[PDB]
Amino acid sequence: MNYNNKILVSESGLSQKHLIHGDEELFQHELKTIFARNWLFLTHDSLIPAPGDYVTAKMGIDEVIVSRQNDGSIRAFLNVCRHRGKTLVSVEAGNAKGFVCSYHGWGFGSNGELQSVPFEKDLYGESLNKKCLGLKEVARVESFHGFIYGCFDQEAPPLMDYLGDAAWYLEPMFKHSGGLELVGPPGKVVIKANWKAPAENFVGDAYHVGWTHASSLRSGESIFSSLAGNAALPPEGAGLQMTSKYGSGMGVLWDGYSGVHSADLVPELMAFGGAKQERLNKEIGDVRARIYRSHLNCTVFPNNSMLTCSGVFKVWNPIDANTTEVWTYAIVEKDMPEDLKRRLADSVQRTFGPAGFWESDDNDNMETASQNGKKYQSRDSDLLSNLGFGEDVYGDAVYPGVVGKSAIGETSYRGFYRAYQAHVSSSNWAEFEHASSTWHTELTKT
Amino acid sequence: MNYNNKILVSESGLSQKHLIHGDEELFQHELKTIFARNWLFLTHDSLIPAPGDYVTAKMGIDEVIVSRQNDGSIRAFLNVCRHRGKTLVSVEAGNAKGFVCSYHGWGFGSNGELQSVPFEKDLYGESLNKKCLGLKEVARVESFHGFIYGCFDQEAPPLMDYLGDAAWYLEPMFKHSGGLELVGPPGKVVIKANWKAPAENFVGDAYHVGWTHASSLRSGESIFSSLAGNAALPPEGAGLQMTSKYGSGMGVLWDGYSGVHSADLVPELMAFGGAKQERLNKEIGDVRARIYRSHLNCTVFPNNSMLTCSGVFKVWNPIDANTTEVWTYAIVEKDMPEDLKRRLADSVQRTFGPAGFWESDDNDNMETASQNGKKYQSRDSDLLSNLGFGEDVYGDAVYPGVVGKSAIGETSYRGFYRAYQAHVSSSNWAEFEHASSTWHTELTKT
Amino acid sequence: MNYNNKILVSESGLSQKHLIHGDEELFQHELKTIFARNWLFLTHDSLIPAPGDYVTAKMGIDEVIVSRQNDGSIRAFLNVCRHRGKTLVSVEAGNAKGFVCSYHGWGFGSNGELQSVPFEKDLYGESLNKKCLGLKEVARVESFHGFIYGCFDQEAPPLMDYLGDAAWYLEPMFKHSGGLELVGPPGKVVIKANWKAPAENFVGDAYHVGWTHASSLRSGESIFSSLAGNAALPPEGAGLQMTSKYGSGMGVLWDGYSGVHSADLVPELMAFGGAKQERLNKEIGDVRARIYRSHLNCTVFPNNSMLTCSGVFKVWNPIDANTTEVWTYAIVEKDMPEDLKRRLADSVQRTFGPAGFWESDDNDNMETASQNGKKYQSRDSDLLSNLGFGEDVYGDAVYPGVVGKSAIGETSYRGFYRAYQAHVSSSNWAEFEHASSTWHTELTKT
Amino acid sequence: INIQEDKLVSAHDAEEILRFFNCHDSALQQEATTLLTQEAHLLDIQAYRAWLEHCVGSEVQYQVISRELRAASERRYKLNEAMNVYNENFQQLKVRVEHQLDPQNWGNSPKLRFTRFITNVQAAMDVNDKELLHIRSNVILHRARRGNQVDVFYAAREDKWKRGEGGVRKLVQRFVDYPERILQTHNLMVFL
Amino acid sequence: INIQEDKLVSAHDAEEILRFFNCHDSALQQEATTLLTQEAHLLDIQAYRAWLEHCVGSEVQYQVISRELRAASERRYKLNEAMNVYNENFQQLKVRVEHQLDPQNWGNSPKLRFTRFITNVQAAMDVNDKELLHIRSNVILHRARRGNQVDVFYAAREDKWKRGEGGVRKLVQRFVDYPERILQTHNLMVFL
Amino acid sequence: INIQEDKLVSAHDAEEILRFFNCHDSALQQEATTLLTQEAHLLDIQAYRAWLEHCVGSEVQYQVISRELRAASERRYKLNEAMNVYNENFQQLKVRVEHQLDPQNWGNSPKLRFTRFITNVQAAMDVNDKELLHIRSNVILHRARRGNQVDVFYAAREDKWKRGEGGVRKLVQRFVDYPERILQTHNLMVFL
Ligand SMILES: CSc1ccccc1
Ligand SMILES: CSc1ccccc1
Ligand SMILES: CSc1ccccc1
Ligand code: FES
Ligand code: FES
Ligand code: FES
Ligand SMILES: [Fe+3]
Ligand SMILES: [Fe+3]
Ligand SMILES: [Fe+3]
Structure with a gap:
């Protein structure tokens, strides 16, 4: 395959060839051009x-x-x-x-x-x-x-x-909260999926939550639970999506500070986050203080993901085109009481760790989507990421990056895959830059 | 490897390079040109x-x-x-x-x-x-x-x-019997053989039966049992072999209506088949009514095989050059009594299913013949299928196709591999047709 | 990869690209040019x-x-x-x-x-x-x-x-001792290492013994035991290293006739070897009689190794770039008492067989060195074999071949890999000979 | 068990549970353990004739099924749910035993190696047939052959055993619902 | 055990040994075997509600850890040695049970197949709480799904069981130190 | 067993069968189960010195063989049929134990994890040595190390145990005929 010429990701990141999740030659090429x-x-x-x-x-x-x-x-x-x-x-x-x-x-x-x-x-x-x-x-x-x-x-x-542009969104939690600690050791599990399957899911996939996680939503009583079985759509203004030049992106679900945590942690967390937000209003302004206590599902390109507030921190370590070693840590705010940090860490592993019941909901989805990329009739097929296309903006007065002002969409898929294609077809950073000089214009077309 | 030029099957289907059972690049090529x-x-x-x-x-x-x-x-x-x-x-x-x-x-x-x-x-x-x-x-x-x-x-x-030409042989059982039913669900087992190893065996291999299946013949008391340990050769006129333009072929063992079934089913089956044959004489003629109650070992090109009368129905699903997933169903005649259908289905699985004792006799043969195709000194070696060459006919007044008028030979191997080579070296159906315009002449040479 | 041009082994055998232990295309090429x-x-x-x-x-x-x-x-x-x-x-x-x-x-x-x-x-x-x-x-x-x-x-x-030149060193034990017998059947175990990892280790690696085998040296009480944990260096004149045109080589540890055998066999063996040496002095001279009862760690190129006196005999059977099937036999001198032969054979398996505690010390070393050759950042890295370079001689009046007059060095690595590179880059024996016409000069440079 | 509440439990599995939870007889569990260990020993050393003579009743049904994968919510599709990998009477078991012992069974040279691990033994007398013993047990079966072929089988066995000739308890029914749908062991040519 | 001499033995493992080597009660070992076999049977047929009701005490801690790989000679690095794959109270186990039984748990269709093998059972009454029963046992757990997915788990279980409602002995603590650091089973979504 | 009729059965296997089928002593089977479970516990926690002191007799022969694959019909070729993977006296076992415990055994850092499953226990007193106890049992041995290395061993063990110091029953012979000819476990460096 000629990586200079092959269109693996179409213009504006609107689709990707399914073979990208299955092709071992491309995996080897990613070792050079991505990793x-x-x-x-x-x-x-x-x-x-x-x-x-x-x-x-x-x-x-x-x-x-x-x-x-x-x-x-x-x-x-x-x-x-x-x-x-x-x-x-x-x-x-x-x-x-x-x-x-x-x-x-x-x-x-x-x-x-x-x-x-x-x-x-x-x-x-x-x-x-x-x-x-x-x-x-x-x-x-x-x-x-x-x-x-x-x-x-x-x-x-x-x-x-x-x-x-992703840094602006991360700073309220990573910096202005007083700082985070990573709680180790991580859980480690091998899944039979391409590293891009969970990376794309964390970067930009709110659409899957109500359906994929119907059982975990219904059973755990967490704060996003109104979504179970697509029983309800997050109201207008419930969140946004963003992406950036070098591929990192995230969803923002406003106010969702207790994240995926079961009702046993909800009152405590919602009290803690709200109290810190009140202090932060004076320091970083109302919007950014609100972002601090909002649930961010983020991928730092290429293969590091997180759910802030939920406290889930992931590395999708590549093994081959259909094998990934998943490392799962917990993130906690340093100034949380120690007992809360301990319970938060256990809850991160309870929901998204090796026996994480939420993460288990994703297994078949990631594994089969990946493995299907090897199947003869699917290699040249197109994976779609067009949801919300034509409604993204850039250079907004309040929210930076390429931004979709809606909670559910595929904005962050498009930015992730635009950067991916620019790297795969480039021999060095200078070529990536040349291939990316109109990155936001490409993403906001139509 | 250049599939336009590489002689993988020699003229008249007389031999094949052993690498065809082992080469993964060729397996990938078969996905396009065969499957x-x-x-x-x-x-x-x-x-x-x-x-x-x-x-x-x-x-x-x-x-x-x-x-x-x-x-x-x-x-x-x-x-x-x-x-x-x-x-x-x-x-x-x-x-x-x-x-x-x-x-x-x-x-x-x-x-x-x-x-x-x-x-x-x-x-x-x-x-x-x-x-x-x-x-x-x-x-x-x-x-x-x-x-x-x-x-x-x-x-x-x-x-x-x-x-x-294979259709003519299948019709007495598939059509004139009143119709067949497939009894599911199938048995499913993975074997470490190339899909072509069992396909070639079912299409044309009577030679192996007395030796490979010596123990099953001796132990089960079926009607082909005189063959155990090559103790006796099927007499002159015991059967024939046929093959066709698009690769399908079969052996015919005259009158063998109870097939591989143990003595517990023999009297019942031989009575049932003979009674229906007597009715069919008037409808389709003596020869075709006899074919109805004759044992056909057939491969429908590329990877579907069957033993009529025995009632064994197989799919050799390809996984890689040395891995095949074997699906085994039973076929029964619709107008058989329900209790007979049930016992026939169990007997099909007893003999050729996941714990089929006959099929077990074939395991090492198919697996090692396949795996040897990867071994360095064997890749360029020639698998032989010359038995009966120079005695096949085409256009016979009674039996259509390329036909060997003997029960044991390699006629059907030659036709199978002639079609295989024509497909592997062709880019589309029109090219296959061009490569096959003298198919029967090639098979009946010398 | 172009094997005519690619420098896999540098001049004088001083280094090798780490990919040689991991690259499957090169493994396939070795099937032709080595095996x-x-x-x-x-x-x-x-x-x-x-x-x-x-x-x-x-x-x-x-x-x-x-x-x-x-x-x-x-x-x-x-x-x-x-x-x-x-x-x-x-x-x-x-x-x-x-x-x-x-x-x-x-x-x-x-x-x-x-x-x-x-x-x-x-x-x-x-x-x-x-x-x-x-x-x-x-x-x-x-x-x-x-x-x-x-x-x-x-x-x-x-x-x-x-x-x-390796034959001269082997003859005292293989010929002048009256002859050896191989005691079967061999142990057989699969390790996840390239065949070259144990081959290079046996051909020329005395450096590893005190450290790798610290625990076996300390625990078994064998005669090389002063080496445990690098507690002591074998004194000057304790041995030598040799290599040859076609790649075979060995280390010689003077007088070490009981080899790796635990103290239970030491007195008996040291008596037996010394008695035969005394007889051999008159027949083959003092030096060669001494070589007979000296421990030789040898690889007969490409993949047969041995420890004389210890009696360990190995075949490193290649499976793929990171898989080798290890066959372990015992060698005994024919004129040893039968009871001693039996105990020697058990001791060979005790130390270097499937549960050989010495061989277990080598597992992680060979497996990880091999597997690292697949890792992206290590493929183009250089494995070093420069110890003792510039002090080797050729044509010595007493000890033939390219010889390092010291017990510990990398002389035999250099000769092994010089021959390996000459074969990998050649299409036939005549080309190997042309590539080897200055073999000893290349090894004795600087 | 209430299978309306325990949504994942089959009626059959619930019925089998009830059998053992009630009248526990420690002596019976020990007899059953002995019976099954001795049976496994005979099979492991490939004493198939001895197995038939000592362990298998003349009226035996020896059955191993493979069940088609269907939706948990399925309630319309009604066709045959399972096929029989084994469904053998005594004479059919004898045929298989003769096939194993035949000197022209080429696959048995060099000799196979079997090792069986029997665990989780439960035993309960039938309520209505006071001479019918229900025994449940799980098996791991390891088969090694030809240097590097290794196949491991895992199953639960629902047995009925009954006193036969000479008062010896023998197998009159074995039922196994094999847990793996697609076998990855080359075949199921082992006596579970 | 002297762990100064037996250099590879942990203080915890030495303490657990001492518990069983002393007062051996054969009747207790048999009770424990029954308790564990019945528990495994309920889990194998996916009777998760019955498992909670019959086998699990209200005060349970159900814990499975994964321990970070550290040097045998390490004595300076002091940070969290392990994470909790499970660390569940009764309500948390109930959440997991409801997740298993939910008809929109897509991964449970077609129905999973579980087979458990419980071995090496040891039992000893607590020295100080005469109503606390220590039970040790090892489990092989085989999970098969979706035609060709097969995952096998191996573990030692340190349990405490205590008489609860109706005098029924129930699990009040399970501790497993999972022996494989990186799981090769897709997940650890099974009840060990 | 008649090995002229049961064509696949070895004379040795037939002899070993006879030992257990006769005088069944339930108490003995339970003693043997305890002995073997405790032995496996000590090995699993890598208490190798305690294993030697408490489980292994001074006169022990600890033997594991690997048998060459030969034709079932072979009767001319007479050379050594097997090699000894282990064939250890007490002092040789001690050497192996010291090798395990040595702080420069680099392969033991990070610490290995062992889990043993002992099943199919049978026990019978020797006919002629009323102090010699024959014990047969099967083992699955799981060894995990270094994140993702997992090796599983399967074997039948023919033991003799005898009362030694302080009346403690200790292993005086273990014989294992390892069922896999080519090991796929990196080595056989485990005590079966
Ligand atoms: C991508 S996972 C996730 C979970 C909860 C909310 C949003 C996203
Ligand atoms: C190819 S299998 C077979 C079995 C019986 C008779 C003829 C063929
Ligand atoms: C290469 S192994 C070895 C062992 C002992 C002495 C010398 C070499
Ligand atoms: S609905 Fe998104 S992958 Fe099917
Ligand atoms: S006789 Fe046909 S493959 Fe050997
Ligand atoms: S010191 Fe030689 S490989 Fe590291
Ligand atoms: Fe998800
Ligand atoms: Fe056949
Ligand atoms: Fe070494």
Whole structure:
């Protein structure tokens, strides 16, 4: 397949070829043009707060060690020995000043440097150039209010610019709330779906909620529960959708601070969020204080998703075109009482974790939509994302980005896939930029 | 591999490259040139007799919904939602006026039409062109005496013409007997063989029976039992072999109406078949009435096989070059007493079903012959099908098609693989026809 | 990938691209340029001593039957029926005058000839040319002191020449000891590593022993036990490393006759080896008699390895780029007392067999080093084998081959990978020879 | 069990439950465990004739079904719900046993290896036939052959056992509703 | 057990061992086996309401954890060692049961098939609460759905059971430390 | 069993059958179940020293074989039929235990997870050594490590147990004929 020419996503992001969820050659191509190029979620400050603390993380199919340095910074390195390629670290988290390879005993620092080689003097003499044998380092590591992302491509925009118009929506919760903590360890489960299936769902899919999650809505008594079985449509003005230049997007459901949490947490959460909102009005204004306590379903392009207020935080780690390893953490506000944080974390896993009953509703949808992309008669078929097309705006006086002023639509699908196509058909960041110089105009056509 | 030029099957179908049972690139090519082009078995009238009745079926690697329409016709559609590609139907059979997608709740009729979209007015307004969003329909659906076949290629010959000379042999049992019913549900088992291994075996392999099935012959006491361990050769005139332009073929074993059934059914069956034959003599003549009660081992090209009289009905559903999902039904004559039909159905599964002891004899043969086609030193080796070559005839005054007037030979292999090669090297039906204008001459050489 | 041009192994064998352990296209290419071209281990005289005795063996991914002929020679044939490709032999060893196919009953002799075809006269008449239907024969089968190797390529050097300078080191144990026996049956286990990972480890990796095997060294009390946890370095003059033109190589650890065997065998073995060495001094000289009772870790290129004195004998049978089937036999000296042979065989399996505690230490090292070769950021990375480079010699007055006069180094890695690269980039033996005309000069540079 | 409330429970499953929840007889559960362990031992060592002679009653029905996947809400479509993978009388079991023992059963060389794990044994005497013993048990059956073929079967067995020749309790009915619709074990050629 | 000598043994595991090695009560082991077999039967036939009513105490904690992989030698890194796949009180179990029974739970059509194998049952009365029964058992849980989806779960269960309404022994605590860190079963949506 | 009639049965298997079919002692079967459950518990929590001290006799032979695949009709080829995956005396088991516990056994970090399922327990006293207890049982052994490595082992165990120090019954022989010829579990580094 010629990725320069092949139209995998049609103009304005209106449709995508179904093969994108199934084609292994394209998956391999995504390793280069999506995962090696873009910002990927690694960890949070709260999980590696002290010098020497480390975790392992996936970046695409690669594994990295992410380590807190003595100077307070974070550096990340390929989890691969520079001698004969053995995996250095076999655990998920810990604290150490370095990592020793179990094959021939080479010792690397937390800073990636080759610090020791057994019997170096007797074996190598002065001939081993250890300065050139440090672990292969992730070129870019940056923080968004404690959330640590990495990028293998030195040419990438800074993380903040990459978030584009999405940052404005995230800041009330990520910054102005006083800050979030990530509660680990994550749940980890393999699903037989393409990574794009859950990514697209979290970025922009409110339409599915009442139907897909009918049983969880009816059974859990959460605040979006009026939707069960499409019994009722969220009223006019219940929310909006947004998307951005580099592909990140989200839905906003106004005021939905208790999110998917069952009635056992609703009064407590609605009290807490409302109290903080009242304080925030004076600081960031009424609209942004309201956004703080509004439910955001967001994907940070390509494969990091979240539900704010619900507190669900996801990494869709790619394995192959029909295999994804799902990591699920909880996010909590730092100034919440500890007992509330604990219950919120359990509730995140209860609803969206490995035995999350809500997430279970999505399984067959994501897996079969993905697997159908391999089927002969479906490869060249068109997945539709035209809902709300022709009603999006850009440059609004209040809400930035390409915005659909309605709670349910496919605005964020279009922006996600516009960026995806621009990357797949480009060889580097400069070409992506050239392919994106009229991004908002393309999305707001007709 | 260049499929226009590569000789995968030698002249006259005398040999085939062993790689055809192992090569995944060729399997992918077969999806286009074999499965998307030819007639594939779907279901029987007896399984979907009433309006709204449906089943799911495979056509190659694709899955379709096959539905009885209100007007009495049958239509078939891809089991894939037109919105974002989710699998519509998760059951194997039922009755419904339509199918609702579990993702976003789109509702399709039994006629494939997009009938409803949740909150269409509020979300899409008048902008959704539902008339262009019907399920992707199988272009051709036709019946052979209740047996329903589908073809994705509008250009295919009618099913009756496609059966070619094979139809003459099938009609006494399929038509003149008063009609057959298919007894479901089928057994379903995955074997690690190429679909062509059982297809070739059923189309033309009498040679294997005495040896492969020595233990089942000795143990079951069926009427072909004199063959056990090659203890005896079927006498001269015991049967014949035939093949046809579009690849279908069969063996005929004269008078073998009780087939593989154990002695417990032999007297009853031999009485029933003989009584009907006596009636049929007056209607279709002695030869054709005899064919009615003769055991036919047949493959309807590409991947549907049967043993008439034994009542075994098979679909070899392709998964990959060394994986096939075997569906096994029973066929019974409609005017048989109900108790006999029940016992016949159990006996079909007893002998050739998931725990069929006869079918178990074939496992290692089909699996290893298939898997050896991947092995480096065997890929370019030649599988032989020359038995009886130079003794076949065409245009016989009594028995039509390319015919070998002997019970054991490889006539039907040659016709099967001649058609296979003509399809693999052709881009469409017109090219197949051009490649087949001297089909019988090629098969009767020397 | 263009194998004529791609530098997979750098000059002097100093490094290799990590993708060589992961790339499936290269694995397929190795089937042609490594496994179909080179000498592969089949069996030992001791396992098929009598006429009609046979075993099955893998040669690359192909399976062969290896049979003792009536005239005392050994011939080997593809385990594939010449009719329709079924696997002929389903057992691992036995005695027979021939092999009958379970599909249609064709009978082949122990000499590969098609001897019988059921009902040949009635079915084929005189038309079946059985003389042209013998099993596909392995072109070359040769013995090195009872150890039987096969090669599919008629153009290969004789086995003795292929062993090159390695033969000199093997002869004291393989020949002058009075001869070895192979004790079967082998252990068989699948590991998720590339075949090259254990091959490279056995050919030249003494560096790993103290660290990888720290726990086995500490726990078993064997004679190399001073190495546990890199507590001590083998003193100067403790051993050497060698490599050869066609890729075979080994380490020599002087005097280590009890090898990995636990203290329960040490006194007995050290007595036995020393007594035989004293006799051998007069026959082959002091140096070669010492080599006899010295521990050799050797790979016979490509995928046969051994530890003499320890008595471990390995075949790394390739399945795919990250899958290898490990066969483990014991080697014993024929003139050892039977009770010692029995205990030695159990100890070989105790340490290096399916539950070999030493071999278990290597699992994660080989598997992860192999699997990392598939990871995107590691494919183009360089595995290092530069230890000892610039200190190797050739043409030494005492020790032949390219030799590193030190116990620990990477000399044998360099020779292994030099030959590997020469084969991968060559179309036949003549091209390999042309690519190898300055082999020792390349290895002894700088 | 109220199946109007417990919406996922079949009438048949509810009836079978009631059988065991009532009169618990510990001695009977132990007898049943012995009976089933010995049966599994005979099968595992491929003593099929001994299995017939010692474990299987002359009036046996040995039945394993595969049920077609239908909608939970289905109530119109009425055709045959299941096919019989096995539905054997004694003579039919004997045919299968002879097929296993036949020296020209090529698939049995080299010899197969069977290992059975029987768990969750429950036993209750029939209410009306005081000589009919109901036994329920679950089986994991592991079959290994030809180096690297490994097939694992999982099932619940609803048995009836009755005293026969010499007072030996023998199987008079086994019913298995096989839980996997599409087999991934090459075949179901094992005695569950 | 001396965990200074048996270096691989956790303090918790050593404590749990001690519980069963002491006062062995054969009658108790048999009661426990019955309790667990009946519980597994109810779950297997998807009688979830009956399971709650008959097997689960009002004060239950039903907990399944997934423990982060850490170095055997680790002693500095102190953050949350595990997450809760389940950590349910009675009302939370009821929510999950209603979710299973809801006719718009699309994933439950066609009906799932469950088969549970309970083994290694041990039972011991609590030393201090003479009405608290400790039961340990291992489970293999086989879930089959949609033709060819097959998921097998393996776990050890540390239970406490106590006499409740009508003198019926009911589950008041289940603790499972799930042995596989990354699930390869699509989800853990089964009651272990 | 008549092995001339039951053509697939080995002489050894027939002999082992006879042992259990005769004098059934229910108390013995229960003792054996306890012995094996406790042994499996100690192994599962990796209390290997405790296993040696409490479960393994000083005179033990601990043996697991892998048998070469041969023709069912073979009667000429006479060479070694099997190799020993394990064939350990007490000191050799101790070496393996020390290897497991060594802090430089890199493969044991992060800590492995074991779950054992013991079923089909049979027990019979030796006819001639009234202090020798024959125990047969089957094991499923699940080993999980490093996120996504999962290995499942299946075997039948022929044990002899005898009263040792302090009257504690200990394993004096275990024999396993491993049913899979080519292992698909990376290794057999588990105590069956
Ligand atoms: C995309 S998941 C979700 C859940 C609740 C509300 C909105 C979105
Ligand atoms: C191809 S199967 C078969 C069985 C019986 C008779 C003829 C053919
Ligand atoms: C390559 S394995 C080995 C073991 C012991 C000594 C030397 C090498
Ligand atoms: S591979 Fe890491 S030290 Fe050699
Ligand atoms: S995928 Fe079917 S309605 Fe959206
Ligand atoms: S395949 Fe061997 S005789 Fe036909
Ligand atoms: Fe959802
Ligand atoms: Fe057959
Ligand atoms: Fe090693």
